[PDB]
């Protein structure tokens, strides 16, 4: 029920800055990062596939806005139409030197932060009649989502070599409630109401719009994977998408945390996100969705 039920207290021999000396150290590893070998014997999960380059502690994962600017002889045309779905003529066009600041927020199932719609929730699919195509919903009013890892983590440094340090979770104290995200129940209900209203235009007024939760697959695809405060969350979002629509309170999403990240859906290049000292707190805007329809 606690955060401590998600952790394994793993002890191992580590190299010292002197090649001929060893170092009996320990660290708290999440159960999602250790795989048993058959005080039992375990090993890090991405160890038969690659070696994990440690997420370098002095570089931040916070996305800064980047503008993509066209070279000489080219121009960037910007569609200023407010009802422009994603395709076809755009009556109002502009030539911008280059785009607005696009924050590269990396997330799944929910478009955290970013740009809102102008007048109404926009539904954008390559072929709305094809269930194999994702539907990019864009909100007009953001839905605020609050993260947390209540634990007061204690980062610990291990010298694994000359000049190289390994940052490990030495101890965990404080509030041991599981990491979670809160979405306002009233705000989310009226946002799905707007999504449903704009979604019946493509399927019928008398059709029944039902939101179910993710089908299956990797934890990166079945969960609202995202980064917040340098530590990577994987939230359930099964209480967000659970409703059937016929023609102060809050929603708490239990989130797991991992330290070994295979981010860009690749195999062979993992990354070890080092522990973040202290309590992590999070304020984001849900500005969109990525939906898939059932055949």
């Amino acid at each position: 029920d606690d955060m401590r039920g998600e952790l394994k207290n793993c002890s191992f021999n580590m190299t010292t800055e002197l090649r001929d000396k060893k170092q009996k150290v320990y660290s708290l590893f999440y159960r999602l990062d250790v795989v048993q070998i058959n005080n039992k014997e375990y090993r890090l999960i991405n160890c038969n596939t690659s070696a994990i380059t440690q997420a370098c502690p002095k570089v931040s994962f916070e996305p800064i806005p980047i503008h993509y600017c066209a070279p000489a002889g080219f121009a960037i045309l910007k569609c200023k139409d407010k009802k422009f779905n994603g395709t076809g003529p755009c009556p109002s066009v502009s030539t911008v030197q280059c785009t607005h600041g696009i924050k590269p927020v990396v997330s799944t199932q929910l478009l955290l932060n970013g740009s809102l719609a102008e007048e109404e929730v926009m539904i954008r699919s390559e072929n709305i009649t094809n269930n194999a195509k994702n539907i990019l919903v864009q909100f007009n009013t953001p839905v605020q989502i609050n993260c947390t890892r209540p634990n007061n983590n204690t980062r610990k440094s291990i010298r694994i070599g000359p000049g190289q340090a390994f940052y490990a979770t030495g101890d965990i104290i404080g509030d041991i409630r599981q990491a979670h995200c809160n979405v306002s129940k009233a705000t989310w209900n009226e946002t799905l109401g707007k999504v449903v209203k704009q979604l019946r235009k493509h399927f019928g007024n008398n059709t029944i719009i039902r939101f179910a939760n993710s089908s299956g697959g990797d934890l990166e695809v079945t969960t609202h994977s995202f980064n917040c405060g340098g530590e990577f969350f994987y939230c359930n979002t099964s209480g967000l998408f659970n409703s059937t629509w016929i023609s102060n309170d809050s929603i708490t999403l239990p989130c797991r945390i991992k330290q070994i990240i295979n981010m860009w859906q690749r195999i062979g290049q993992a990354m070890y996100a080092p522990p973040i000292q202290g309590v992590i707190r999070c304020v984001s805007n849900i500005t969109g969705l990525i939906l898939t329809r059932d055949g």
């Epitope: 104290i173 404080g174 509030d175 041991i176």
Partner: antibody, heavy 127, light 107 residues
Framework: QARLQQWEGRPLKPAETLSLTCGVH????????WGWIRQPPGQGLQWIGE???????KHNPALRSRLSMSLDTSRNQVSLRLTSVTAADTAIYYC??????????????????????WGTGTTVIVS | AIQLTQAPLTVSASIGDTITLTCRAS??????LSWYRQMPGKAPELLIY???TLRGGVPSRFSGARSGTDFSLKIKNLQPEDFATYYC?????????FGQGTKVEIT
């Protein structure tokens, strides 16, 4: 067999440096914290200061800027360097190990420090 | 800082009695209050930590209670080794403080 041994430093002249040393046997300086407790004659005990597990130096407000402690990890010794000793500092000085046990209140986990292991006593008299 | 008030400063009882010692704090220090016994001429020793937990080796006669302000220690089946000076020590705020000391003697 775990004991803290400290030896008498003999009487010292007023307005000097008070150098104490505690010998840690059975256990080592790591992991716990080490502090100093005194006891003026016919009176109760008084807290001087401690070094906690983190290596951080808690000092009593009454003794301002005249306090300094150190840990000899190689020799397993705890040192006290009280300066400008006045006649009111005539007391038996004890070396203690503030041990950390975690006690779980309803939802909160704390490191509780409770001076597990006491020295034998160093009667310091200034005249 | 936090001031611990320990009363009565001198309680007298014969061998085979039951005594209750009081240590009142200034603020609320939760349950972090340990008890130390100083035999005359010896060094103080830990009896009770966290106001309820008995130290390894202390007989079951010793017992504490309360987690607010009026902390209490109860001794049962008094023996000559219990006639010493008891101190209550708080561990909530970093300006640590001791009690005044309750000298328990024979009548």
């Amino acid at each position: 067999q775990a004991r803290l041994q400290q030896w008498e430093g003999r009487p010292l002249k007023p307005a000097e440096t008070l150098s104490l040393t505690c010998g840690v046997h059975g256990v080592g300086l790591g992991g716990s914290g080490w502090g100093w407790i005194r006891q003026p004659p016919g009176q109760g005990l008084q807290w001087i200061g401690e070094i906690d597990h983190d290596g951080s130096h808690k000092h009593n407000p009454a003794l301002r800027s005249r306090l300094s402690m150190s840990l000899d990890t190689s020799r397993n010794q705890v040192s006290l360097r009280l300066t400008s000793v006045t006649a009111a500092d005539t007391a038996i000085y004890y070396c203690v190990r503030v041990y950390r046990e975690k006690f779980l209140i309803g939802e909160f986990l704390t490191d509780y420090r409770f001076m597990d292991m006491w020295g034998t006593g160093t009667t310091v008299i200034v005249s | 800082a936090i001031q611990l008030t320990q009363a009565p400063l001198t309680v007298s009882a014969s061998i085979g009695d039951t005594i209750t010692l009081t240590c009142r704090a200034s603020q609320d220090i939760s349950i972090w209050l340990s008890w130390y016994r100083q035999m005359p001429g010896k060094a103080p020793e830990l009896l009770i930590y966290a106001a309820s937990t008995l130290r390894g080796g202390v007989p079951s006669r010793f017992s504490g209670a309360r987690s607010g302000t009026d902390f209490s220690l109860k001794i049962k089946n008094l023996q000559p080794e219990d006639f010493a000076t008891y101190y209550c020590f708080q561990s909530d705020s970093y300006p640590r403080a001791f009690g005044q000391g309750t000298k328990v003697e024979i009548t």
